[PDB]
Symmetry: C2
Subunit: 82 residues, 2 copies
């Protein structure tokens, strides 16, 4: 229940990358628009699911991303420009 | 001048991944349509540039990919279906 690390609102140009992370002082879980983050070839979780990377961001990536430690939470909205 | 590893022609559905590699018995370099492989957020070289990964493949990824050891070569054409 003590999350730290760079989950902040943010804007990215289409076709680029977003790299964020949460670290808790338990198991970290991720949501997009309050639903479990569907991993796909461009979405890669690392290191106990603390690092989230999205490659070749497209419009469908835009939304509200939550990283939860289970109970603490951080939310951030991602805008895809261009 | 002795390249080995899975550079073969291949078909992939749009939005998926391609993972190939060349390994020489010198420095490995990669081309697409005989031009230097422009790295972008979806194109990641690893391990001395022996592993090539493309995430969230799109139509523009389609083409002829060469891995050169400098002098040996392998070529493979990649079709993006769907």
């Amino acid at each position: 229940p003590t999350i730290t690390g760079n989950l902040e609102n943010q804007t990215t140009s289409i076709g680029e990358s977003i790299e964020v992370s949460c670290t808790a002082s338990p198991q970290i879980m991720w949501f997009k628009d309050n639903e479990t983050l569907v991993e796909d070839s461009g979405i890669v979780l690392k290191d106990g699911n603390r690092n989230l990377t999205i490659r070749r961001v497209r419009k469908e990536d835009e939304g509200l991303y939550t990283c939860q430690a289970c109970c603490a939470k951080v939310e951030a909205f991602f805008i895809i420009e261009g």
